[PDB]
With several copies, the nearest count.
Chain A
Amino acid sequence: DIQSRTPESKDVYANTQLVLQRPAAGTVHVPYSQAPSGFKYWLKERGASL
């Protein structure tokens, strides 16, 4: 979902499906809808290694 050339690289690729939402009545905040971290999900659902 996030792709970079090296861990110290400058330019990055990002496809996370980020959309802003309207804030709550009399509230200052930035509500948003975004798909959770693919790397964090994979770290849980990868199974056994070679």
Chain B
Amino acid sequence: PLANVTCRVPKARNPTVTYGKNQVIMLLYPDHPTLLSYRNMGEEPNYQEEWVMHKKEVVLTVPTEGLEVTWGNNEPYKYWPQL
């Protein structure tokens, strides 16, 4: 019979992160197709999703409210700019 169980999934390796003036740079190195999603922590979230497969460099703007980035099965990374 069909029964609800628990599935074990792996977490993708941490990308090379470099900070800049109101922007975040990520060097993504995926072994398998990994999903990258990001949203703003304010009034306008503006959700964007993309399946990363090859070596990619992504530049994301960080607003005053904050930017939440989810890289695969890893816990969401939260970023805030310095005053």
Contacts and interface: CB of A to CB of B under 8 A. Distances in A.
Interface of A: 35-36, 41, 44-45, 47-48
B74 interface: no
Interface of B: 13-14, 29, 31, 37, 47, 49, 54-55
A44 B29 CA distance: 9
A35 B14 contact: yes
Contacts, number: 15
A35 B13 CA distance: 7
Contacts of B29: 36, 41, 44-45
A41 B54 CA distance: 11
B13 A45 contact: no
